[PDB]
Every structure is written in structure tokens, then in C-alpha cells.
Amino acid sequence: SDKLKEAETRAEFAERSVTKLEKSIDDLEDELYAQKLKYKAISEELDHALNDMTSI
Amino acid sequence: KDLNELQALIEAHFENRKKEEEELVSLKDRIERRRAERAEQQRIRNER
């Protein structure tokens, strides 16, 4: 009985940890996507600048 | 010719980083595919 209780507690702890880790990794992926979006926006602005500089 | 070679390499690294950005976008897309598949399989596990 003692061993079973220990195992059950370990399982609950690990499950909660996996839930937190999944949420955190999803949030960080969202943040990376946002920063990539900003980089792409300024890169397209610079590409337009280069297109005009082709006439420069 | 300096300006010519420089603008040439400029457009060149433009294209290179552009391909890299395309690859990274495809990476993000398959990443979201992975998010969705993990979500559905996790949800199935949790349902059971």
C-alpha cells in the first residue's frame, strides 16, 4: 500500500509538470512567432527600400 | 564596379536569407501542425 501511494503521487506530480511545460512551450513558440513577424515586416520594408535603391 | 558587386552581393544575401526565411516559415507551419497533433492526441488521452 505504501508503494502504491508513492507511485500515485509521483504520477500526479509528473502529469502536472508536463501540463505546465506544454503550456510554457506553446507560449514561447507564440513569442518567437511574433518576433519573427516583426523581423519579416522590417525586412519587407528594407526590401522595398532596396527596390527603390535599384533606381538610386 | 564596387557598387555593382556590392548590390549584387546585397541582392544575393537577400535571396539567401529569403530562402532561409521560407524554410523557417515552413518550420513554423509544421510546428503548428505538431502543436495541433499534440493537442488532439493529448486531448484523446485525457478523454480516456
Question: B14 and A50 in contact (C-beta within 8 Å)?
Answer: yes
Checking A44-52 for CB contacts under 8 A at 24+ apart, the result is: A47/B14, A50/B10, A50/B11, A50/B14
Residue A36 CB contacts under 8 Å (≥ 6 apart), including other chains:
B24, B28
Residue B14 touches partner A, C-beta closer than 8 Å: yes
**Cα separations (Å) of A3 from A15, A35, B42?**
18, 48, 28
Could you give the angle at which helices B2-47 and A2-54 cross, rounded to 10 degrees?
150
Minimal-distance CA residue of chain B relative to A19: B42
Minimal-distance CA residue of chain A relative to B27: A33
This structure was determined by cryo-EM
| Residues in A touching B31 (Cβ below 8 Å) | 29
Nominal resolution (angstroms): 5.0
Q: Compute the distance between CA of residue B16 and CA of residue B10 in angstroms, rounded to an integer.
A: 10
* Beta-carbon separation of A54 and B7 below 8 A: yes
Please name which of B42, B6, B25, B26 lies closest in space to residue A36, comparing C-alpha atoms. Answer: B25
